Each structure stands twice: as C-alpha cells, then as structure tokens.
C-alpha cells in the first residue's frame, strides 16, 4: 500500500494549498514571502506550494539549545541563541529546528495543516 501512502501525502498537501489561498491571496501570498525576504517570479504560485509545506513538515522556531531564535535561509539555517555569558550555540542544519513558523495575520490561522499531513516535505531549498 505504498502507492495509496504517497497519494494521501499529495493529496493533503493539495488541500492544505487551496486553504491557504483562501486566506492569502496573490496580493497577501507575496506578502508572507517579502517578510521572508523572498521575492520570487517562481513565487506566488510557489508561495501557496512552499508555504503550506513548511508549516506542515518544518518551518524554524526557538532553538534553547542556546536560547536562541533560528533564523534560516534557504539551503542553510542559522540558529543563534545566547546560553552562557560567554557561550552561544549555532547550529548549521539546511533544515531548521522544525515547528511552526512565523506567518502574517491571515496565514497566521494556519495551525491544522501539520495535524492532518506533515510528513517530512520540501522547502525553499532548490
Ligand atoms: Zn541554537
């Protein structure tokens, strides 16, 4: 039953795309990417695509390795926190610390995504 696995994992995501267009339209889609700092043509269509995945499989929250707040970028995710008067961690995983992430007023209701389908899907990194 491997097949009917990847089509209910497609399928979730889908569905988890179409919700959040709902909520962020072309106008409010590019606006939680430019917060992101992203600005993409291959953007809009992939805002609501790679959106809707890193909320579900991992977008980057607190670290406490170091108290820290992990700030990422594509292909290479930053995590600095302050631990000791003299000592911090960072850590270097392309992938951040998963959880939910930072999304404006309206993609901000996005909380069930994750619940229903979050398997360990792609993000901004090409
Ligand atoms: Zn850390």
Do not use: H
């Amino acid at each position: 039953k491997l097949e009917k696995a990847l089509k209910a994992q497609n399928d979730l995501i889908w569905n988890i795309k179409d919700e959040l267009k709902k909520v962020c339209s072309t106008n409010d889609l590019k606006e939680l990417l430019i917060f992101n700092k992203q600005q993409v043509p291959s953007g809009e269509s992939a805002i609501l695509d790679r959106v809707a995945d890193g909320m579900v499989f991992g977008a980057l929250l607190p670290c406490e390795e170091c108290s820290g707040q992990l700030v990422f970028k594509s292909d290479a995710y930053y995590c600095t926190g302050d631990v000791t008067a003299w000592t911090k961690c960072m850590v270097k995983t392309q992938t951040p610390n998963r959880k939910e992430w930072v999304t404006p007023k309206e993609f901000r209701e996005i909380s069930y995504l994750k619940k229903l389908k979050v398997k360990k899907q792609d993000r901004i990194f090409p």
